[PDB]
Design a protein around this ligand. Structure first.
Ligand SMILES: Cc1cc2c(cc1C)N1C=C[C@@H](c3ccccc3)[C@]13C(=O)NC(=O)N=C3N2C[C@H](O)[C@H](O)[C@H](O)COP(=O)(O)OP(=O)(O)OC[C@H]1O[C@@H](n2cnc3c(N)ncnc32)[C@H](O)[C@@H]1O
Ligand SMILES: O=C(OCC1CCNCC1)N1CCC(F)(CN[C@@H]2C[C@H]2c2ccccc2)CC1
Ligand SMILES: [Cl-]
Ligand SMILES: [Cl-]
Lengths: 661, 133
């Protein structure tokens, strides 16, 4: 209903958010009746925006389609519409305007970087009528949303995946752009070193174990609190090893106590074979003695008659005993062939499994763009409660289409590498240079700077960008603490389709652990004949040094073994990502490094407020603002995250330089 | 929640596999060794046992004595009275034996006798003999 637009705008339909409490304290502090009115108006206005986001939703249009007693209080409907508009919940992305842009602008903002974060903020600010100018070092928009293009060849070297549209801003963006979304067919066959598929049997019973090993770490973390180890924070990788080892340890521990339960038995059989031999002994004697005593032909005196009969009894007694002990010898000797027949598990994981498990890990290292040795055990999956609903998709026609759409009508200076950001009581100046002739110098004066510099860049030692004055310890410590990962792509273009065309993706399994990431997974999801090989894990780092050709080598080799040396052509043209080495990225995206938390994502978003110009003068406005995937706790390292981080700062900058709404 | 089923992780076990740099592969080889010990101890007690089975090869078949099936009479012959005393002399009160020995007295009759004659066969004096053993 309306309830669905609240979920699609990532909001609870039935409750007011902290953001809302801040802006509508009268409402939220007061009568339960008015809360529900507020919540309907909000939910409805969202529904309205959402049911057609290609045209601006004016205050008028909203009041038009409202019911009574809701279109009663028009100040309240206004306050709500303006709130939604500011915080980028309605009229965001690429709408057809109704009332053209403010004739005369108010405030100047410099945005560093035309990433999705950048472009999203730019459009918001511009539409609130500010003078916005983006400074991009690259000769193109998009940053870490790159697409490769040539004839009909088309392949993202950047982001390629939409994480499914249930609460995804990109839901709306995709309705506003020629964005060919194609769901990802979840079948992914694996293929060990040699080339042989992995029997379905196994594939399942490793992935089973993988999922179990993770749950295991979550147990190890939450329940046993295994989160520091001799002063260092605990890695997920560390925990995973610990769990696996304790699984090898049990496998053995069980064998031990089984063979142990045999000797208990096999050494009871010994304590009996003894009684039974020292009875074949005692019975030997007794029989002789009875034979000898039956020698005495009758008639005999009653002592010799008794001696016969006595011995006869005595010997049928011991013949009973020995029959009741070979009773026992029978049972014990079965009980032994039982234990001989079902022996607990030989090993924990065949070295051929440990290799397939290593690919399930490689996949996790891809997702997180880092060695699992780096991920915070405690926090690596803090975003997990916020994932959208829906199957993941891919942009069939290049994700680039989105940045470019957003960039239309914005003042973007390409080939403008920011070198120094200065911020003071009175304003800011950004000193940039031309990327081509470095010595050609530019100076931008502005009321505010929005910094969408990537975390990799913020991290560069020595600094690519100088802050004057320098970022405070609280900010710089956050930047050191967070993880910035890496993850490359090999774009293989071919003359025709030599692979299963109903298969979106298929893994390769590396011989050793140390190379689990190395072209571990291939994607066919473009129209022309194109394969994408991921390098993830410790591998991504090292592959950047090894040369384009060698890589395309290791690459073809891997494909031949799986598709036969006949059907694998030389590639028409090839590309290799090198994101750690790209100085406008210094890597791929953020991760929760051990010894970080989500709270660092929050510090990264906190704007900086300069000291006062003259001592003893009032507290200034803050001047230096931050967006990008590293700034949004709840949707890190994604496009939608950046997109949102942008919308967010624009509202925060407008609230500051244009007064609240 | 609680550790995924089958997966085993005691509090105590984790300390053991972390508390130094390779307490890992100590505790693991420790068992690899303390295993092959128990496997070799089985080999002993399996060969020790297959000797004692050689030594029993025969069962007790040559040494077993046919079952005399006897008509549990109530006639006390003077023959039977003496057998009885001598059994009392050598079994104490194991009335079951004393029946099996005579071979025509139910444990009833043996207990009967045991008091009827009693003073006539100084059975007190006789039983106090089975004491010195
Ligand atoms: C690199 C990369 C990223 C993947 C990606 C693959 C690769 C290879 N993907 C892989 C898996 C994917 C994924 C999916 C779900 C969850 C996690 C990951 C995905 C993808 O498949 N799906 C997804 O949603 N995000 C991906 N991501 C994450 C998103 O791409 C990024 O978060 C997103 O595009 C970030 O946009 P933004 O925060 O604005 O940073 P960006 O670097 O784009 O823009 C900053 C601008 O600063 C510029 N710049 C720098 N230094 C300067 C300077 N000194 N002076 C002036 N200008 C400067 C720089 O050149 C750039 O134009
Ligand atoms: O469908 C996909 O293909 C991969 C397939 C997975 C199934 N089997 C075959 C391969 N993907 C890949 C990226 C994804 F795995 C999610 N990524 C991490 C949660 C994000 C996270 C967490 C913490 C810090 C940063 C980021 C989803 C979409
Ligand atoms: Cl506040
Ligand atoms: Cl680090």
């Amino acid at each position: 209903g309306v309830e669905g637009a609240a979920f699609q705008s990532r909001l609870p339909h039935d409750r007011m958010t902290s953001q809302e409490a801040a802006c509508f304290p009268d409402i939220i502090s007061g009568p339960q009746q008015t809360q529900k009115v507020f919540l309907f108006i909000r939910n409805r206005t969202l529904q309205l925006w959402l049911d057609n986001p290609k045209i601006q939703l004016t205050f008028e249009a909203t009041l038009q389609q409202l019911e009574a007693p809701y279109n009663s209080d028009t100040v309240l409907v206004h306050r709500v519409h303006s709130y939604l508009e500011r915080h980028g919940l309605i009229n965001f992305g690429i709408y057809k305007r109704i009332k053209p842009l403010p004739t005369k602008k108010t405030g100047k903002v410099i945005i560093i970087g035309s990433g999705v974060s950048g472009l999203a903020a730019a459009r918001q600010l511009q539409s609130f009528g500010m003078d916005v100018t983006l400074l991009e070092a690259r000769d193109r928009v998009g940053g870490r949303v790159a697409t490769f293009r040539k004839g009909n060849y088309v392949a993202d070297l950047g982001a390629m995946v939409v994480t499914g549209l249930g609460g995804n801003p990109m839901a709306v963006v995709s309705k506003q752009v020629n964005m060919e979304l194609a769901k990802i067919k979840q079948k992914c066959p694996l293929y060990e070193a040699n080339g042989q598929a992995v029997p379905k049997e196994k594939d399942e019973m490793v992935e089973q174990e993988f999922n179990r090993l993770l749950e295991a770490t979550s147990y190890l973390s939450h329940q046993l609190d295994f989160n520091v180890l001799n002063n260092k924070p605990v890695s997920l990788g560390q925990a995973l090893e610990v769990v696996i080892q304790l699984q090898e340890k049990h496998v053995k521990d069980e064998q031990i106590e089984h063979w142990k339960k045999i000797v208990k038995t096999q050494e009871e059989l010994k304590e009996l074979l003894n009684k039974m031999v020292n009875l074949k002994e005692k019975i030997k004697e007794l029989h002789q003695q009875y034979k000898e005593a039956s020698e005495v032909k009758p008639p005999r005196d009653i002592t010799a008659e008794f001696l016969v009969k006595s011995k006869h009894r005595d010997l049928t007694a011991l013949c009973k005993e020995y029959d009741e002990l070979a009773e026992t010898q029978g049972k014990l000797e079965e009980k032994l062939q039982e234990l001989e027949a079902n022996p607990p598990s030989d090993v924990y994981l065949s070295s051929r499994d440990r290799q397939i498990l290593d690919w399930h890990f490689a996949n996790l290292e891809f997702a997180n763009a880092t060695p699992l040795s780096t991920l915070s055990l405690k926090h690596w999956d803090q975003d997990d409660d916020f994932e959208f609903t829906g199957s993941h998709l891919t942009v069939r026609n290049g994700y680039s289409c989105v940045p470019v759409a957003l960039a239309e009508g914005l003042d973007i200076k390409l080939n403008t590498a920011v070198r120094q950001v200065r911020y003071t009581a009175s304003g800011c100046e950004v000193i940039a240079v031309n990327t081509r002739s470095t010595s050609q110098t530019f100076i931008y004066k502005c009321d505010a700077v929005l910094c969408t510099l990537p975390l990799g860049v913020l991290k560069q030692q020595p600094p690519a960008v100088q802050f004057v004055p320098p970022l405070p310890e609280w900010k710089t410590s956050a930047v050191q603490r967070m993880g910035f990962g890496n993850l490359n792509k090999v774009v293989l273009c071919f003359d025709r389709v030599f692979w299963d065309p109903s298969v979106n993706l298929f893994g390769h399994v590396g011989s050793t652990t140390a190379s689990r990431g190395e072209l571990f997974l291939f994607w066919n999801l473009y129209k022309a004949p194109i394969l994408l090989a991921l390098v993830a894990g410790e591998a991504a780092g090292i592959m950047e040094n090894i040369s384009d050709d060698v890589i395309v080598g290791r690459c073809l080799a891997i494909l031949k073994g799986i598709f036969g040396s006949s059907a694998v052509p030389q590639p028409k043209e090839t590309v290799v990502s090198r994101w750690r080495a790209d100085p406008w990225a210094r890597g791929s995206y953020s991760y929760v490094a051990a010894g970080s938390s989500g709270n660092d994502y929050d510090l990264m978003a906190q704007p900086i407020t300069p000291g006062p110009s003259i001592p003893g003068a009032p507290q200034p406005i803050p001047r230096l603002f931050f967006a990008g995937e590293h700034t949004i706790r709840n949707y890190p390292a994604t496009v939608h995250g950046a997109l949102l981080s942008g919308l967010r700062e624009a509202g925060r900058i407008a609230d500051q330089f244009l007064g609240a709404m | 929640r609680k550790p995924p089923k089958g997966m085993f992780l005691s509090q105590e076990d984790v300390e053991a596999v972390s508390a130094n740099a390779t307490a890992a592969t100590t505790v693991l080889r420790q068992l690899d060794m303390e295993l092959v010990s128990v496997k070799r101890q089985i080999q002993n007690i399996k060969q020790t046992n297959s000797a004692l089975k050689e030594k029993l090869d025969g069962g007790i078949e040559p040494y077993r004595l046919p079952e005399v099936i006897q008509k549990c009479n109530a006639r006390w012959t003077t023959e039977e009275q003496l057998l009885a005393v001598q059994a009392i002399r050598k079994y104490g009160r194991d009335f079951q034996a004393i029946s099996d020995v005579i071979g025509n007295k139910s444990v009833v009759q043996v207990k009967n006798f045991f008091v009827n004659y009693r003073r006539r066969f100084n059975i007190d004096e006789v039983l106090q003999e089975w004491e010195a053993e």
